[model samples]
Target: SMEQDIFLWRKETGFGFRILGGNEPGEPIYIGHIVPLGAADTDGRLRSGDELISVDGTPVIGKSHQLVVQLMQQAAKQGHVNLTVRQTRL
Candidate 1:
């Protein structure tokens, strides 16, 4: 199955995280900046500014934007994925 890995992060503080991978037809993927929400954000276990670190235990450290999307697609189709992430600003 093919899917997309989308990385989200804050513009000012860089504190959000990666969302779970979804199928390609599910959404249009892109990269940009957004602001971080406060505690209310943590309720979702992810927010607006954190960096997406890894997917299903695979390191995304040096992955290109396009490659990450490919990885995400695979993760999504697998039903569930364990992502290693960090909420830098939190």
Candidate 2:
């Protein structure tokens, strides 16, 4: 298997989505679903398992989930969620 990168430009309502991983050391952080269809689903250009690379151009690689969450929380300004991420593949 190999890896790839995907930069998805999106927007959110208080982010309106969830995130998984990035907790354990060396574990990568990935996207979750748009639980709030009312807000995020409308502009859901992103999907699950896209490993986070940057938050609005801020590098997130190897960053703790704790930090990631704060970044995400603040990222919801001007209705933009500029995310660059990595993906796994065969």
Candidate 3:
């Protein structure tokens, strides 16, 4: 289930973040880290460890990190993108 909305605009460099793919085998993809003062980080909505459920509106729950990155990059061509994330429970 979705928990929050993160609106991001790609910088000349790129959306500033890294992702960690599913670890065990079936785990979902997750945000590995956010670049401070960058697009996603500047929005202050995404956090490390957040489970990335979808990009734009396409589900990425089981997708590889490379695919997800490609999707995000594709969306960036339009100037912005929306990320639906579920925050990890500590």
Candidate 4:
């Protein structure tokens, strides 16, 4: 089975992270920045450079950053979102 780290965020307003689209087509999306002391940061799991794998249950490995953002925005309206991510190696 394929396994991934799941990070849950409950935000009535913001998700507390910024994503940077891959420079070239077909590249993986990555976390550009995480707001310190915010939801993602406080949860203590998500980090910059971590590659986004999916949103909710939808696979987003090769999706455009804008599409992922839109999906997240829609998910946010439901009060929470589940993010599956691949941890980056140093």
Most TM-score-accurate candidate: 4
Candidate 1 structure quality by residue, lDDT tens digits, 1-45: 213343333223233334333224333222233324622243355
List pairs with backbone clashes in candidate 1: 3-73, 5-69, 9-49, 10-49, 15-49, 15-50, 16-49, 16-50
Which stretch of 10 consecutive residues in model 2 shows the poorest summed lDDT?
1-10
> Tens-digit lDDT track for model 4 on 13-90?
377888887555578888778987778888887888878878888888777777787878887787677888877553
Q: Give the candidate number with the greatest lDDT.
A: 3
Tell me the tens digit of each residue's lDDT in model 3 across 1-90. Answer: 347878787888678888887554456888887888888887777888888888898887776666676887788788788888997544
- Model 1 residue runs over 4 Å out of place are 1-43
What lDDT tens digits, residue by residue, belong to model 2 across residues 1-90? 223433333433355667788787567778776566634455555556667767777777787888776776676544556667665452
Cα deviation at 72, candidate 1, in Å, is: 1.2
RMSD of each: 11.5, 3.8, 2.7, 2.9
Off by over 4 Å in 2: 1-13, 36-39, 77-79, 87-90
Look at candidate 1 and tell me the lDDT of residue 11: 28
Order of candidate numbers by lDDT, starting with the best: 3, 4, 2, 1
Scored by Cα lDDT, where does model 2 land? 0.63
Scanning candidate 4 in windows of ten residues, the lowest lDDT window is 1-10
Better of 2 and 3 by TM-score: 3
* Pairs with steric clashes in candidate 2: none
**Clashing pairs for predicted structure model 4, backbone only:** none
